[PDB]
């Protein structure tokens, strides 16, 4: 437990298409929890930092560690409940405890938020793609070591999906439409299935994303290019709830035409500012458009769902790459034709 | 007592083409025959005369205008409606068998008939007529002691109450109302009665802001002259925001001013809104709800006006006889001089 300076190799981005694993140094001192990272997933936030060196308007001004969905083992902890060698999933959220949104238990909307691998503030918060990382004790969520290492790495994306399902309101016995079955969309499929949806219909252009959608629990699969949607759009819509995850303006219109009047449409996917929104369709049908952003307490639920085998995300795991060949993994994850979820092994 | 009686109607046939015509109905003792005594000019009637279309619905055949009218019962097939009874005419006639009507969402009725709406073919005739035969369920009685000028606000108040109910819980909340026209002012009075703790309205015209103060608004705001930084700090200030004007800049201010996970009720229609900041709605998780017409709040609006829950007379700008139809529509389209204009029959 003695205060020591441990070494680590961190996945670091410096700019647009500038990426390298560098030497680093953290000085541990009996405050917080020292965690050896074992596995981490590549999200869309990480690809944007490598492809364009930015997310939305947030640019990278100094080198930063990537990754925000990360699991590992405990090495040292200031809490006696967290034993050494314990398998934990790292919650990338570290909010303050005194702002108005965190007081109301809406920690996902914290004013002084510090998310893993987020270039929102400067200096940016370093991510989890590193061999050793010192983290807060409350950010360590234990799980039984018998759980599959490859399954638990889906803790953060599942939390994003579970939170998106709760933004829909009542789901028991409802008819759910899920436009865009990427990694997040497929986890929303299994989320609404577990939460009691009576019929899940999902749509995507690539049949590969549809093939993954049926394996995650979908009942009907539609391709907007080929199949016709007119019987879904009949009598002011058919579905109680719609999930827009692709972020494409074409898919947003269909969700409005497909959702019944006074229905709920959960906006998950982000694709800039939509440039021609049918606001008249929203007013006429009284649709309840609700946004979804990250998660609050659904991270502990996702760790429980994955450990107890409620859902099985392994069909989404496309490939594994050692953390030393990091750029090759970023190039492979950006290819949407072959990679759904790519994990880094530490 | 079958009878044929003549009537005068306020008919539009195209853009700017407006005339008062003579018509003849055939009252065969089914429904209820009423003499319309007073009617209010709404934004739909102006859009039909200013450009011949509401949104994307053009006027193809001549149509009677108006959907905010009151009157007295001439004859009725029900013994409960005594002749001469003052009534407010509900412009909605929903079916009783569709999906949304069974679930008590008749404002979203698949087979809906609304006064003076070009959404259907043939268009449903409006209420701007000296005599009109209507369904008995569309007649809502009110005590004859009530003011005729006050009860004419029944339809726009019913729209405001329905919009306030889209907000969810309003007791002790901080509401922001962007666009404080006639509908916006009635929303000010609605959430005030429903228990809003603080009402802040915003508009460019100082005349409309002066009307909002009399309707119960706590703080008045001109969005260009006043600094709105205080209400945008910490990802927003107000629990609920009411977008009523329809301008994109007003939509943007409501998104920045509403706190995260707040409610934004969209009332004003202003075309397929372009350059919509969807990223702001995602990051803050604002619940954007739409409000369309009304359902059961029409009976509530008639009861509010008959018992003086809210007095809408500060919104009445001018009274015109229905003979000077095109004179009133020209005066109603002038926002500098008019808020709500009434036609008397
Ligand atoms: Zn906070
Ligand atoms: Zn119906």
From Swiss-Prot, chain A:
This is L-idonate 5-dehydrogenase (NAD(P)(+)). Binds 2 Zn(2+) ions per subunit. It holds the Pfam family ADH_N. The gene is idnD. Pathway: Carbohydrate acid metabolism; L-idonate degradation. InterPro entries: ADH-like_C, ADH-like_N, GroES-like_sf, NAD(P)-bd_dom_sf. It comes from Escherichia coli (strain K12). Its EC number is 1.1.1.264. Zn(2+) 1 binds at residues 43, 68, 156. Its cofactor is Zn(2+). Belongs to the zinc-containing alcohol dehydrogenase family.
Curated annotation (Swiss-Prot), chain B:
Binds 2 Zn(2+) ions per subunit. GO terms for molecular function: L-idonate 5-dehydrogenase (NAD+) activity; L-idonate 5-dehydrogenase [NAD(P)+] activity; metal ion binding. The keyword Acetylation does not apply. Zn(2+) 1 binds at residues 42, 67, 155. It is an enzyme of class 1 (oxidoreductase). InterPro entries: ADH-like_C, ADH-like_N, GroES-like_sf, NAD(P)-bd_dom_sf. Zn(2+) 2 binds at residues 95, 98, 101, 109. Disulfide bonds: none annotated. GO terms for biological process: D-gluconate metabolic process; L-idonate catabolic process. Its EC number is 1.1.1.264. Pfam families: ADH_N (PF08240), ADH_zinc_N (PF00107). It catalyses: L-idonate + NADP(+) = 5-dehydro-D-gluconate + NADPH + H(+); L-idonate + NAD(+) = 5-dehydro-D-gluconate + NADH + H(+). Its cofactor is Zn(2+). Pathway: Carbohydrate acid metabolism; L-idonate degradation. Keywords: Gluconate utilization, Metal-binding, NADP, Oxidoreductase, Zinc. Belongs to the zinc-containing alcohol dehydrogenase family. PANTHER family: SORBITOL DEHYDROGENASE. Catalyzes the NADH/NADPH-dependent oxidation of L-idonate to 5-ketogluconate (5KG). This is L-idonate 5-dehydrogenase (NAD(P)(+)).
């Amino acid at each position: 437990s003695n205060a020591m300076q441990v070494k680590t190799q961190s996945c670091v981005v410096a700019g647009k298409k500038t990426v390298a694993v560098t030497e680093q140094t953290i000085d541990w001192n009996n405050n917080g929890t020292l965690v050896q990272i074992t596995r981490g997933g590549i999200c869309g936030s990480d690809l944007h930092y490598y492809q364009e060196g930015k997310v939305g308007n947030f640019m990278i001004k100094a080198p930063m560690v990537l990754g925000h969905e990360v699991i590992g083992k405990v090495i040292h902890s200031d809490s006696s409940e967290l034993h050494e060698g314990q398998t934990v999933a790292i919650n990338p959220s570290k909010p303050c405890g005194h702002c108005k949104y965190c007081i109301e238990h809406n920690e996902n909307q914290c004013t002084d938020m510090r998310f893993f691998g987020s270039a929102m503030y400067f200096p940016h918060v370093d991510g989890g793609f590193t061999r050793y990382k010192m983290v807060e004790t409350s950010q360590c969520v234990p799980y039984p070591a018998k759980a599959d290492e490859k399954v638990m790495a889906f803790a953060e994306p599942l939390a994003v999906a579970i939170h998106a399902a709760h933004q829909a309101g009542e789901l028991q016995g409802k008819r759910v439409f899920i436009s865009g079955v990427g990694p997040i969309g497929c986890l929303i499929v299994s989320a609404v299935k577990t939460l009691g949806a009576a019929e899940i219909v999902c749509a995507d252009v690539s049949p590969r994303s549809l093939s993954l959608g049926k394996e995650m629990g979908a009942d009907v699969l539609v391709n907007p290019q080929n199949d016709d949607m007119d019987h879904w759009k009949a009598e002011k819509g058919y579905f109680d709830v719609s999930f827009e995850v692709s972020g494409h303006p074409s898919s947003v219109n269909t969700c409005l035409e497909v959702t019944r009047a006074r229905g709920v449409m959960v906006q998950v996917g982000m694709g800039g500012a939509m440039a021609e929104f049918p606001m008249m369709t929203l007013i006429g049908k009284e649709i309840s458009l609700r946004g979804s952003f990250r998660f609050t307490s659904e991270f502990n639920t996702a760790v429980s769902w994955l450990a107890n085998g409620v859902i099985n995300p392994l069909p989404l795991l496309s490939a594994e790459y050692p953390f030393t060949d990091l750029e090759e993994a970023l190039r492979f994850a950006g290819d949407k034709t072959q990679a759904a979820k790519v994990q880094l092994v530490f």
